[PDB]
Each structure stands twice: as structure tokens, then as C-alpha cells.
């Protein structure tokens, strides 16, 4: 995952 | 400094409050210690940013990514990795839904001996840019002597406890770390370990993690003396229909427990419009519209962001840290610095009624008690013996024009800093 989006 | 508690570089402020601040590459470069291998637990990774904050030099060795990345998203990662000859991965198990990865670790295994670094940021350029994380670095840990009998542990019980917490992994690469780790002595550790792990505990091990391993460390290594509790974190659970459910009953009461005021702080719409990196700050305080819909009681908890103290109140929070100040706040019983938000999740719920805790999801945090250094209370430093809390107290309400920054509405009545607006879709 590179961030929560 | 007994602490080795610190904040992260935050670009664009003044360098002075830089000054007792690391970057990632500062915790990695050769001052630090000869790297010989490294594991990185994480939830979220940018692989080719992460390489390059390693120095030139040590940018080969061997480095674990332990993630917990399923289907398609594990699929990315690998492919993100596959360059990188010298990169493994542990993907962790995730048996309960609503699971996350949560833990942000650093295991530096070098020449000179180990070290190990527990921390709040992702491992992405975002993280480490313009928030306010919060970073514990251990001491160098010496390899124990290859003709003697000792145990490495700390009074805190520290080695024991990060073993247990890689154990309940249960992975083959990890076993490696752990007798990494039974080889060195780690016994001037003076912080306890709280860690979450995903599963249901029932009997002793009901104490084994989450907020009541947190109750069981503060009746056994606090005394007791309208001492409030601050609770602060970048991430919302659901917690029920009213405080009862959860938040006041089983949270609180591990919260309050040594040998009552509640302050609960997150941004509001306000602090994030107004900060380094404006709107886009919220893509990292993913509190929903569904979820706090259900819960509007909670937000009369809710106090905002304000770091005059540190320089950063505008370096939005994604350290989460947990304490108990007196009621002046000049002092402190305990602080704790972790990678756990305000969720059920992170902290265990109860089931079964009383008789099993659920929690979802790995988490990890230190816990520095006055007791570890001989002490009865910490002072709060004023200006980031005494504990350096990096934001404002005491923490100030929001006023009745505030409301709680939740990620997934449009903000268009007001530019942020950047003079963007904020549209969701
Ligand atoms: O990586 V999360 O607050």
C-alpha cells in the first residue's frame, strides 16, 4: 500500500 | 537524555526547531552504527523512496518488509521490490477482518551490535515531510560475549517482550530476528513494550496485549496518588452509540489505572486547512463520514491541534501518543509514543462478555514509566529528568464553529493554504 489512498 | 524520544525533520519550518529532530536518513547513516541487515514492519511502503533514504553504502544489504499487503496490493508490492535483489518480504498474517499492519518498526542489525527503533510514520516521503511523527531509538545493543551465561534483559523485560511480539507473527523470516536478538544484550533498556496482535485472548493472556497489557504495566509499575488522561492519534474508529460501549468503559478504565477528565486530541477541518501541506494533510486522517456520523457524542471530547511548544502546529499529527499529567499538567505518571489510534481495532474489544479480548490488528508502542528511572512523576519540559511532550497543554477545546477534519467530504467554502480546495471522488 504507498498510502491510505 | 534517558528518553531518546524525538520528532521527525518537518521541512519548512525554522531550523532551530529541527534541531534535536531526525530524518529517516539520519537513523540509517554509518554514525548510527556499520549495517549489516535491517527489517522494516510497516503498513504502508514506497520501496524506491525507502532505498535511497539508506546511505550509498549500505544501500545492498539485506532488508525485510514486513507488511500486511493482500491479493492485488501484495502483488504491487512485490513488483515494487523485485529491482532490489537485496529485499525480502513477511507478509503478516491477517486473520481478522478490519486487520491492519500497523506496526512501524526499524530491526538495524550492524557490525557493532543491534539497535531497534520504533516509531509512527509510514515509510513513504509523505510521512517524514511536513507531519509530526515521534521516533524512540534504542541504545546500541552489544552482542553477548560467545563465553558467557547471561539473559540481555532489561528490567522492563524488553528482549522477552519484542521476542513474544515477533513469536505471535509466526513467520519464518522473522525467527531469524528473534535469535538476532536472543544473541544480544538488551538490558539497558528503561521503556516497556506495548504491542497489539491480531486474535482473541481469553485467560491470562487477556493481559498479553492491547490497553490491557497497558492496565496490567500501570498496576504493576505505577502508584497511585482527577489526574486527567490525554489521548492523542490521526485515526477514528467506530466506537459505539455512546461513551458507554467502549470509549469510557473497558478504554478508559486500562487509561486510569496506577497501582476523570478525558482529553482526546485531533485536528479539526481548521488545523489541516491551515497547515504546511493544507487539505492534503487529510489524507492522512482518514476519519469517515460514515463513522463519525454514528458517534457525534465522541467530538465533544475533541480538542485541537496546537504544538507552539515544538514548532508544529502546523505539522499535522501522525504520532499518536497516550498520557496522564496532573492537574496542572506540569507533570506526568506516564507517556506513551505508539503507532495505536483511537480504534477498537488497535486497543482490543471485549467479547464474549469479559471473557475475551478482540483485537484486529498489529500495533506497537514504548511506554516510559517514572518507576524504569527511579522516579514518581516526570516534569513536562515547557519548551521542546523531564519527559519532552512535543505538543501544547493544557489541550484547548474546540470552539463551537470547529468541527473534526473527516477525510471523505468536499471542503470548498475556504482555500487552504495552498489556495486549493479539498473534492473527494
Ligand atoms: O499508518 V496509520 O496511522
Not at chain 2, 296 to 300: E, K, M, R, V
Given at each position: 500500500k504507498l498510502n491510505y489512498l | 537524555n534517558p528518553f531518546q524520544f524525538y520528532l521527525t525533520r518537518v521541512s519548512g519550518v525554522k531550523p532551530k526547531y529541527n534541531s534535536g529532530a531526525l530524518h529517516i536518513k539520519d537513523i540509517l547513516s554509518p554514525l548510527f552504527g556499520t549495517l549489516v541487515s535491517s527489517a522494516q514492519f510497516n503498513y504502508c511502503f514506497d520501496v524506491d523512496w525507502l532505498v535511497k533514504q539508506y546511505p550509498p553504502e549500505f544501500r545492498k544489504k539485506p532488508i525485510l518488509l514486513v507488511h500486511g499487503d493482500k491479493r492485488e496490493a501484495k502483488a504491487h508490492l512485490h513488483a515494487q521490490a523485485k529491482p532490489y535483489e537485496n529485499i525480502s518480504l513477511c507478509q503478516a498474517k491477517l486473520d481478522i477482518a478490519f486487520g491492519t499492519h500497523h506496526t512501524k518498526m526499524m530491526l538495524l542489525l550492524y557490525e557493532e551490535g543491534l539497535r531497534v527503533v520504533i516509531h509512527t510514520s509510514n515509510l513513504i516521503h509523505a510521512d517524514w515531510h511536513q507531519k509530526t511523527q515521534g521516533i524512540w531509538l534504542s541504545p546500541l545493543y552489544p552482542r553477548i560475549a560467545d563465553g558467557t551465561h547471561k539473559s540481555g534483559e532489561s528490567p522492563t523485560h524488553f528482549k522477552a517482550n519484542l521476542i513474544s511480539y515477533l513469536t505471535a507473527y509466526n513467520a519464518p523470516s522473522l525467527k531469524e530476528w528473534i535469535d538476532v536478538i536472543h544473541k544480544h544484550d538488551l538490558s539497558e533498556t528503561n521503556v516497556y513494550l506495548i504491542g497489539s496482535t491480531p486474535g482473541r485472548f481469553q485467560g491470562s493472556q487477556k493481559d498479553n496485549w492491547g490497553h490491557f497489557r497497558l492496565k496490567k504495566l500501570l498496576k504493576d509499575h505505577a502508584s497511585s496518588m482527577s489526574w486527567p488522561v490525554v489521548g492523542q492519534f490521526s485515526s477514528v474508529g467506530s466506537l459505539g452509540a455512546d461513551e458507554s460501549k467502549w470509549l469510557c468503559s473497558e478504554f478508559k478504565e486500562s487509561m486510569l489505572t496506577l497501582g476523570v477528565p478525558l482529553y482526546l486530541i485531533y485536528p479539526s477541518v481548521e488545523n489541516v486547512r491551515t497547515s504546511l501541506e493544507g487539505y492534503p494533510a487529510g489524507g492522512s486522517l482518514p476519519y469517515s463520514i460514515q463513522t463519525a456520523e454514528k458517534q457525534?457524542?465522541?467530538?465533544?471530547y475533541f480538542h485541537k491541534w496546537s504544538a507552539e511548544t515544538s514548532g508544529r502546529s502546523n505539522a499535522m499529527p501522525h504520532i499518536k501518543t497516550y498520557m496522564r499529567p496532573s492537574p496542572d499538567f506540569s507533570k506526568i505518571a506516564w507517556f506513551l509514543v505508539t503507532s495505536a489510534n483511537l480504534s477498537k481495532a488497535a486497543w482490543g474489544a471485549l467479547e464474549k462478555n469479559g471473557t475475551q479480548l478482540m483485537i484486529r490488528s498489529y500495533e506497537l508502542g514504548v511506554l516510559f514509566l517514572p518507576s524504569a528511572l527511579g522516579l514518581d512523576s516526570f516534569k513536562v519540559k515547557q519548551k521542546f529528568a523531564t519527559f519532552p511532550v512535543p505538543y501544547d497543554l493544557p489541550p484547548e477545546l474546540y470552539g463551537s464553529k470547529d468541527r473534526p477534519w473527516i477525510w471523505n467530504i468536499p471542503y470548498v467554502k475556504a482555500p487552504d493554504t495552498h489556495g486549493n480546495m479539498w473534492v473527494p471522488s
Open positions: - | 457525534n457524542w465522541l467530538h465533544s
